[PDB]
Request: fold
Amino acid sequence: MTITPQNLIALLPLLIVGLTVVVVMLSIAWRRNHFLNATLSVIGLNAALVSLWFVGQAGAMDVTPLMRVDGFAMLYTGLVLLASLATCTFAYPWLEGYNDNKDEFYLLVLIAALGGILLANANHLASLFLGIELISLPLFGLVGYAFRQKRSLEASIKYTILSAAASSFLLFGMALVYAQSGDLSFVALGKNLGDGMLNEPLLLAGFGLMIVGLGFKLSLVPFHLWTPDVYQGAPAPVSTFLATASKIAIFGVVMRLFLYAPVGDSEAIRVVLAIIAFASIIFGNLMALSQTNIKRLLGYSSISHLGYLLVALIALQTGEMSMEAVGVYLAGYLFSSLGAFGVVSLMSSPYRGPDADSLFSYRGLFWHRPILAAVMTVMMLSLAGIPMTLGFIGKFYVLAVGVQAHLWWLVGAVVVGSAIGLYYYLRVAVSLYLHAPEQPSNWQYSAGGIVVLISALLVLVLGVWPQPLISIVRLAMPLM
Amino acid sequence: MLLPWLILIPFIGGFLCWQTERFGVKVPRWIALITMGLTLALSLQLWLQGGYSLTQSAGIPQWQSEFDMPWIPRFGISIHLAIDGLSLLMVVLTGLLGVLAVLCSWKEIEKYQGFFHLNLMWILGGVIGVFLAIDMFLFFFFWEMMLVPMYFLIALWGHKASDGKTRITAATKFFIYTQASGLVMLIAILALVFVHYNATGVWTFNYEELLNTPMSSGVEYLLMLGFFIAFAVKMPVVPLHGWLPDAHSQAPTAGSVDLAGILLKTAAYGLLRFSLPLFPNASAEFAPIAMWLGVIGIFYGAWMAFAQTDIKRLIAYTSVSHMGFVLIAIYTGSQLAYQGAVIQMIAHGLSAAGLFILCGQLYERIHTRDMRMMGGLWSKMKWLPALSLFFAVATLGMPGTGNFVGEFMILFGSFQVVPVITVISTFGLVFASVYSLAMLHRAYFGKAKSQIASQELPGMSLRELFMILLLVVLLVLLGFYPQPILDTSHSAIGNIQQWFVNSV
Amino acid sequence: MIPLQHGLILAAILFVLGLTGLVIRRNLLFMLIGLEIMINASALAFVVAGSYWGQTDGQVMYILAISLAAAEASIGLALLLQLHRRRQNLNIDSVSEMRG
Amino acid sequence: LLKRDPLNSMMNIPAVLSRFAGKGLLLSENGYLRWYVASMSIGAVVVLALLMVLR
Ligand SMILES: CCCCCCCCCCCCCCCCCC(=O)OC[C@H](COP(=O)(O)OCCN)OC(=O)CCCCCCCCCCCCCCCCC
Ligand SMILES: CCCCCCCCCCCCCCCCCC(=O)OC[C@H](COP(=O)(O)OCCN)OC(=O)CCCCCCCCCCCCCCCCC
Ligand SMILES: CCCCCCCCCCCCCCCCCC(=O)OC[C@H](COP(=O)(O)OCCN)OC(=O)CCCCCCCCCCCCCCCCC
Ligand SMILES: CCCCCCCCCCCCCCCCCC(=O)OC[C@H](COP(=O)(O)OCCN)OC(=O)CCCCCCCCCCCCCCCCC
Ligand SMILES: CCCCCCCCCCCCCCCCCCCC
Ligand SMILES: CCCCCCCCCCCCCCCCCCCC
Reply:
C-alpha cells in the first residue's frame, strides 16, 4: 500500500535518522571535524527521541506491508536510540585519542541505529532481514575501527565472517518459510494450516535456520562462541553498542515474530527454544566464572542474560505478561550494560594507539576513581539480580513468567545461573575496592561520567521503586 | 505509624554516618550511637504503649500495630508492616544488639569509618524490616537487603590478620548460600501468589490474604520446602550451616558485625510467622524430618564446637546446636515449646553476643585466636576470664540464665509432643556442657602455652566492661524473671499455635 | 512443470557445499568465496519460492540478498587486504590471539 | 573424625562441579574462527534434527 502523511508522521524516527546520516555525511565531505559531526549525530538522535514523542501522539498502524508502528515499536526504538546516544558520548573521548579519521564512527553508529529502528518496527521478513543487516555491517566497521590494533582487526574478521554465515542461514530459512507459506508477513507464517497440522516440516526447518541466524545475533548457545572475542577485541564504545542496542533490537523483532506468527506456538519450536534457554543460562554463567578480563566476563554475562530473556519469550503464548517482562528486563539490562561498559569505556579513553595495551585493571579502582567504582559496583549488583536494583526487577519478572507457565526446568536454571553470577559479579565488585600496587579534563569525558552516573541512579531508584517503569512498559502495548 | 520510622531511622542514620564523616573521624560512631539509641527507645515505647501482657489470642491476623502504603500496585505489592508481641520482642532485641554493636566498634577510628557505620545501620534496618514486613515481597526484599552490607563488611572490614582472599571467600560463600536460598523462597512466594490468583482472580502479596489458600498436598509441600530451605540456610540447619563459622571467623574483629548481622535469628521467626500458618498441613507432615534435622544439628554443632581450635568457630557451632533446639521446638504443636523457643532466641542472642564481644576483646589483648597458644589467662587478665566463665556457664544451659528457661520449656513441650527426640536433645545438653568446659579449660585455665599468654594483659575499659555487665544483668534477669517476655509473646504464640493445630 | 522441491533441493545442495567450503578451507579468501556461495544459494532458494507462487517478492528478496552480498563482500575483502598488509599471511588460524 | 567439617564439604562439592564444568566449557573458546563456524553448523544440525524429531 501507499504511504500517507499519517504513515509519514509514524515514520519520523527512521526519517530523522536517515536525514541525520545524509547531513553528517555532507558535513564530513565539507570538512573533517570531530566535534561538529559528533554534535550533529547526537542532535539527530535526540530529535529522533522527540520524534518518538510525536509518533506516540499519533496512532498505531501498519506503515507498509513491511512496517508496523505501535507502542512496542516506540519502546524498543527509544531503547535503541538511548544506547546509540550513550555510544556516541562514550565514543568521543576514545576517538579524541584516535589518530585517523574519527567521524565515520558516527556515520556507522547512525546507520546501525537506523537498523535498530527498522527492527523495532519490522512486521515483515523483508524488514527483519534488512534490519539485521543494517545492524551488522556498520558494526563490522565499528568493531574493526582500530584495525591497526591486532585485537580489533581479529574481532572484526571473526564478527564479519560469522555474521555473513548467520545471515546466509537466516536468509535460507526465510526462503524455506516463504516456500511453505506464500506470504512473507509475520502474521501469515502458518495461516494456511489447520486441524493440528501446524508442524509442517518445511516451515519448521525454515524457522530452525532462522533460529540459527537469530541465535548467532543474540549470543545464544550454541551460537555464542564469538561473543567474548568480539566483546574484548572491539573498541569499548563499540562493545557498549554491541552489548546493548544490537541485542535489544534483535530480541524485540524476535518477540514480534513469535507473537504474530501462528507457528510461534508450535510445541517443537517451544522445546527447542527451551533447550537453548537452559543451555544459554547455564553455559554463560559457568563460562564467566574464571575470567580476569572484564569484557569477556560481560560477554558471557550477555549470553546468560539473553538466556533469561529467551525464558521470558518461551511463555509468550501461554501467559500474558511475557511482553511486559521482556520490556522491563530490557530496560534494566540496557541501563546496567550502559553503566558497566561505560566505566570500561571511560577508563580506556582516550585511545592509547594500536601498540599500547588497553587493559582495564579494575583492581583498586576506588582509590583513584571512586564515583566510577560506585557506578561499576551498582552495575555488578544489578546484573547479579540483587534487590534494590532494576536487574532484580527484571529477574523477578522472568521468574514470575516462568512460574505462571510451569517452566520448572527454566526456573531452576535461572536460580542456579543466578548463584554462579553472584560469584563472579561479586568477585569483580569487591576487587574494585582492594589495593593495587600501580596502574579527561574536558566536558565530553564528564558527559560520559554523567551518563554512567545517571544509569546508576536509574538502576537504584527503579530497583527500589519500579512502578514508573512497569507503568511505562505496560502502556507500550503492541497490536493484539 | 511508627513502624516505617522503625525501619527508616537506621537508614537515615547510616546516611548521616556516611555524610558527617567530613566534620570528623570520631563523629560517625556518635551518629550511629544516637540513631540506634532512638531505634531502641522507639521499640521500648512500642512495648510500653502496646499492652502486650493484657491482650488475648484472637487468631491470625491480629496485629498490635499496622501500616500500609502501596508500592507496586501492578502486582498488589505494598509496604505493609505490622507488629505483634513476637515481632516486638525481636525488634527490641535487634535494637539492643545494634546499640551494643555501635559500642563495640568504638575506639576504632580510621578513614571510611562512616561507611562501616552505614553498612552496620543498613544491616540493622534490614533485620527490623524482616521482623516487621507482613507482605511477602517486602519480606523477601528485606531478607536479601541485609546481605550486601553484610558481604562488604566481611570482605572489606573483616579479620585484618587474614590473607585478604579468605575474607572474600567467606563473604562469597555466605552471600551465595543466603541469596540462593532466598531465590528459592521467591519461587515459593511467586507460586503461592499464582495459586491464589488462580483461586480468586486478584493479585496480592499480603500474608493475611494468602492464608487459607486452597491447594493440594503436593503443591503445599513444595511451597513449604522452598520456604524451609530459605529459613534453613539462615537458621542455620545442617547441612546448610557451612557459611556460618567461616563468616564468623572472617568477620570484623570487634565482633559488632556478628551481633548486627550474623547472630540474630530472622529464620526462626520466619518459620513461626510464614511456614506454620501459610502451610500448616505441609509443616505437619514435614515435622519428623525437621525435628530429626534439629537433633542432628544439636549433636553435630556440639561435636564441631568441641573440635575447634578457634574460639570464634567454637561459638558459631554453639549457635548451630542451640538453633537445632529451636528447630525442634518450632515443629511441635505446643504453646509451651513455642514460648521456650522465643525465650531461647532472646537468651541465645544475649549469650552469644557476650561470647563474641569477649572473644573480640581477648583477640585485641593477645593478638591470636588459637586456643593452643594460650592458657592460664585467669592469672593475667583482670575482668575478662570471669565474664567469659559466666557466658560459658550461660551457653552451657545453667539455671539462673535465660538459656536454661528457653531450653527447658522447649524440652517440656517437646516431651509432651515427642518424647524420644526430647530425650536425645537433653543428651545434647550434656554435649553442650562438654564443649563449654573444654573451651574454658583450653583458654583461661592451666599453664601458659606461649610467650604472649605469660604476660600481664591490660584490663577492660569502662565502656566494654559496662556493656558486658549489662548483658550479664539481662541474662540473669531473664533466667530468674522471664514472665514479662512470656506475657509479651503469649498472644502471638497462641495465634500461631492455634492456627497450626486447628487446620490439621 | 518443474517441481518446487527440485529447485529447493538444488539450493540446499549449493548452500551445503558453500558451508563445507567455508569450514574446511584455511585461507580467508576461500572462506569469503564459500560465504558468497552460501548467500547466492539462499537467494536462489528465494527466487525458486517466488517463482512457484507467481509473486514478485522472491526477486525482491533476491535483490536485497545480493545487495547484502555485495556490501559484505566489499567489507570482507577490505578486511582481507588489511590482514595481508599487517601480517603478509592469509592464515585464518594464525589470527587467534583472543581465547578463553 | 569430624574435625574437618564433612557436611560443609558435601555441600561445597557443587562449587567444585561448577568450576570443573566451567573449565571444561572454556575449551570451546579456543579462538579459532573455523571452529566457530563449525560450531554454528553443528548447532544448526542439532536444531534441525530436534525440530524434525519433535515435529
Ligand atoms: C523514568 C524512568 C525510566 C524510564 C526509562 C525508559 C527507557 C526508554 C525511553 C523511551 C521509551 C518510549 C516509550 C513510549 C511508549 C508509548 C506507548 C503509547 O502508546 O503511548 C501513547 C501515549 C499517548 O497516549 P494516547 O492518547 O493513547 O495516544 C494514542 C492516541 N492516538 O504516547 C506517549 O506517552 C508518548 C511517549 C513519548 C516518549 C518520549 C521519550 C523521550 C526520551 C525520554 C528519555 C528519558 C531518559 C532515559 C535515559 C536517561 C539517560 C541514561
Ligand atoms: C534449585 C532450586 C529451584 C528448583 C526448581 C524450581 C522449582 C521446581 C518445582 C517443581 C514443581 C512440579 C509440579 C508438578 C505438577 C505440575 C502440573 C500440575 O498439575 O501442577 C498443579 C498445579 C497446576 O494445576 P491447577 O489445576 O492450576 O491447580 C491449582 C492448584 N494446585 O500447580 C500449581 O498450581 C503450582 C505448582 C507449584 C509447584 C511448586 C513451586 C515452588 C517450588 C519451591 C521450591 C522447589 C522445591 C523445594 C526445593 C527443592 C530443592 C532445591
Ligand atoms: C541439602 C540439599 C537441599 C538444600 C539445597 C539448598 C541450595 C541453596 C543453598 C545452598 C547453596 C550452596 C552453595 C555452595 C557453594 C558456595 C560458593 C563457594 O563456596 O564459593 C567459594 C569459592 C571460592 O573459593 P576458592 O575455592 O578459594 O576459589 C577457587 C577459585 N579461585 O567459589 C568457587 O569455588 C566457585 C563458586 C561457583 C559458584 C557458586 C556455586 C553454585 C552451585 C550451584 C548453586 C545452586 C545449588 C542448588 C542445589 C545443589 C545441591 C544441594
Ligand atoms: C551445578 C549443579 C548443582 C546445582 C543444581 C543441582 C540440582 C538443583 C535442583 C534440585 C531440585 C530438583 C527438583 C525438586 C522438586 C521436584 C518436584 C516434583 O517432582 O514434583 C512432583 C510432585 C508434584 O505434586 P503433584 O503431584 O502435582 O500434587 C498434586 C497431587 N499430589 O511433587 C509431589 O507430589 C511432592 C514431592 C515432594 C518431594 C520432592 C522434593 C524433594 C526435595 C529434596 C531437597 C530438600 C530436602 C528437605 C530439606 C533438606 C534440608 C533443607
Ligand atoms: C546504595 C548503593 C549500594 C551499592 C553500592 C556500594 C558503593 C557505595 C559507595 C562507595 C563505598 C566505598 C566504601 C569503601 C570502603 C573501603 C575501606 C578500606 C579500609 C578498611
Ligand atoms: C548444570 C546445571 C544444572 C541445573 C539444573 C536445574 C534443575 C532444577 C530443577 C528442575 C525440576 C523440574 C521438575 C519438573 C516436574 C514436572 C512434572 C510434570 C507433571 C505432569
Remarks:
- Strands of chain B lie at 65-72, 77-83.
